[PDB]
Amino acid sequence: AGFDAEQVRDKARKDLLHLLEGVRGKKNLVIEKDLAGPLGVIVKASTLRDYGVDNFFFLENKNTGTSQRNIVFIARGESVRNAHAIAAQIKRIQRESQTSHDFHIFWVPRRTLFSDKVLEEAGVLGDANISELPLYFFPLERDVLSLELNDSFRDLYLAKDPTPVFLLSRALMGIQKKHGLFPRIIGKGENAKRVADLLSRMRQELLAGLSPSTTIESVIIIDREVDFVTPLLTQLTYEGLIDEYFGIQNNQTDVDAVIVGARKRKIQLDGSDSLYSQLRDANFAIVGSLLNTVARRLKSDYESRTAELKEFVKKLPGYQAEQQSLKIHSNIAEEIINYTRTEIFNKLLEVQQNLAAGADPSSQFDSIEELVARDTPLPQVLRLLCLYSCISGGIKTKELDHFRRLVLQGYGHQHLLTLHNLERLQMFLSKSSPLASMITMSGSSGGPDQKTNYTYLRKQLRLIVDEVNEQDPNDIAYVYSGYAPLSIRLVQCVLQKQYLLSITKGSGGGGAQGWKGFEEIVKHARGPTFDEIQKDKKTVFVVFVGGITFTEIAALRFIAKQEEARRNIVICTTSIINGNRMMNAAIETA
């Protein structure tokens, strides 16, 4: 009766395959490198072959073949870069003749004016048959939908491109068209508010036949800028650390070849593996113990004491898969264990946990300087400086100038750009800057965009949970060993008020809706608080504009398990983000 992630995949594959069915004959396929990964989430390469794909090409390789007269470009239309690349590629192909003279472009999801103009301005516009592929959300898991806009953090927060926000609201409207209006549109933050506004004005346009869902409870929209502190921190879940040290993209990562046990190899990382399903959301401290329990259960099943010989060989493939999974994750865990034992890592964690806990950030000054002396990697130092700034309402000017110098001398003068970019993103500011001040009620004002108050909210939303036990956690704070992501505490102000009241005020009636009971507190997080009513169990879509971490996902699944009876939780996002990705946005954007 309600939403299911599998229908998004089916529609996506159907939509793509139909367009491939419109290009009659076999065809060559040119794809934006970044789109290639997410496309694999909805269709298998073997399937594309069955629909006439002779060869596959990455647009950026600039080496499209001749073997087939049909050429198909698949790329994002919002990208200024792609419009040029495709035009260049058509002209370069046309003049290496007589090769392949039937061009198609599938723009994702929408044809833009800028793109149509570039093609015409290059002359090739009357040569390509242009379609539109309405792919928005890619379902990475049953409970995780992603726009897979890996540059959207930079695009939105640095470059001020509104496109990620527009695309997210269209994706969200799509769901309303199929399952009814979200009864409630709830959220925090300037960009999340704009998502609501665009959802509103889109509805208003349709009335020119759409009713509240019977199967959807609400949509909660968190704006990532409300809480930079969470991504800056080192993630301490299993998947979180795999992301921190190896990097996860399209449900995959690359690891040294010795790790897979027979350059580096690619490994799949999703819920189809029974073991990873149990490991990914666990605090890394209990992973060794989880592996041990699995290995033991495995040894026990093997030892659990004709034509059962042929039964054995049929079961042979399932035995390697389990074995291979256990072997690979044991090897990864041992790798991460090594990393987390170094003095640099222990020193890092210490400064992060102190700042997070609320120690005077000046008391961490000598530690930070020592981290620079030891040449710890640039992204890790920058993430500390940002945490410092973001958590304490800016850095003391005199310390800022010192840190600024250490960074430039230690890692290179080019990083003056990096720091200016961190300044534009408002994660590296002096206390003397008006933009740096956190929200208070004794705050006078100024402040069009006053910042989240972590000093106040640490207490009021109980960001620090000293007691949490990682072996059978009782609180989302487990994802950072004692620290609770603010973003998800905000989701809890809506979804688990009984519980949240229980651990902050007492006497946790508290099963009604909106931000009731938390409005004055949530006023101290950045941007607008909103709650808009539009006039089996139900799904709550929890949405992040500007990126979610694997730790927030783990914490959301934790809550999902507790809320199992009453709700289903579906996580939506413009992309999956982490601390390193944010620093890269600042480093690489000239």
Residue numbers in the entry: 5 to 212, 223 to 276, 296 to 338, 344 to 546, 556 to 582, 600 to 654
Reproduce the article's own wording on this structure.
Vps33 shares the overall shape and topology observed for previously reported SM protein structures. Following the nomenclature introduced by Misura et al., Vps33 contains three domains: domain 1 (residues 1–138; red), domain 2 (residues 139–248 and 502–667; green), and domain 3 (residues 249–501; blue), with domain 3 further subdivided into 3a (residues 249–380) and 3b (residues 381–501). The C. thermophilum Vps33 and Vps16CTD–Vps33 structures provide a first detailed view of an SM protein from the Vps33 family and of its recruitment into a multisubunit tethering complex.
The structure of C. thermophilum Vps33 was determined using MAD phasing and refined to 2.6 Å resolution. The two copies of Vps33 present within each asymmetric unit of the crystal are highly similar to one another and can be superimposed with a root-mean-squared deviation of only 0.56 Å (over 580 Cα atoms). The positioning of domain 1 in Vps33 is substantially different from that observed in all previously determined SM protein structures. For example, after domains 2 and 3 of the two independent copies of monomeric Vps33 are superimposed, the two copies of domain 1 differ by only a 2.2° rotation and a 0.6 Å translation. Our Vps33 structure, the first of a class II SM protein, makes it clear why Vps33 is unable to bind N-peptides. The structural basis for this key distinction among SM protein families can be understood by superimposing domain 1 of Vps33 upon that of other, N-peptide-binding SM proteins. This analysis reveals that the binding site normally occupied by the N-peptide’s conserved Arg side chain is, uniquely in the case of Vps33, filled by Arg-115 of the SM protein itself. In this case a displacement of the Vps33 backbone, relative to other SM proteins, causes the side chain of Leu-129 to occupy the binding pocket. Thus, both of the pockets that in other SM proteins accommodate conserved Qa-SNARE N-peptide residues are missing in Vps33.
